Amino acid sequence: MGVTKELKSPGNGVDFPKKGDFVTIHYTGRLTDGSKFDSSVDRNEPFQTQIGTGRVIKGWDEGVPQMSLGEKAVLTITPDYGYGARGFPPVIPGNSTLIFEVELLGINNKR
Amino acid sequence: GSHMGVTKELKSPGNGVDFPKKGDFVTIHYTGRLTDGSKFDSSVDRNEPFQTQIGTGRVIKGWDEGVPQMSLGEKAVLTITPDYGYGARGFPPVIPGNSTLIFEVELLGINNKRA
């Protein structure tokens, strides 16, 4: 639907993020033309957030819990599950499909 | 995480006569940075100016407010914290995890008028 997850590197296949859990990921976002618009990897600063509570775009809220701990995957997100038709120009153009590289580094106190 | 709205720093003056009005198509070279100084976006690095209509909501609120305050050829820095929607406090972030974004802006053109 609005977001598809495609695995790249498997995790422990046991620990999955649940609602309320605080998740720690390293990511890179790209538009459909292949150009990068944001990356935590470039800053060497992993991003931390609660995941079941709509604190991020739906693409992350739905996609991330489908990953296991230590998994690397690519989240392909429609504008609907993303920043919509408005977007956030010039940072993110309107009606943009987002392709994230995502690495789940931690779930609560797991790592 | 203190800032609110838009703060405009004047770096270098333009011609001081030609300001973008509502509906004008504007040419801009910009660099986006975080509060710590990290660069996350740049039209300069793409060697191609960002072109958009101004004052019609085709860019974020902070830009529609800040850009018409510049004259043709002006260099300025826009410290922007969205009041509503994506990127604002209480909303899902555009650049996780921030709300205040800083834009170095050079007004290169107003319609067919070039600096």
Author numbering:
A (entry chain A): 1 to 111
B (entry chain B): -2 to 112
Copy text verbatim from the article accompanying this structure deposition.
The 12-kDa FK506-binding protein (FKBP12) is a ubiquitously expressed peptidyl-prolyl isomerase with considerable homology between fungal pathogens and is thus a prime candidate for future targeting efforts to generate a panfungal strategy. PPIase proteins all catalyze the cis/trans isomerization of peptide bonds N terminal to proline residues in polypeptide chains. In addition to its role as a PPIase, FKBP12 is a member of the immunophilin family and is the target of the immunosuppressive drugs FK506 and rapamycin. Three extended loops, which have been called the 40s loop (between β2 and β3), the 50s loop (between β3′ and α1), and the 80s loop (between β4 and β5), surround a deep active-site pocket that binds both FK506 and rapamycin.
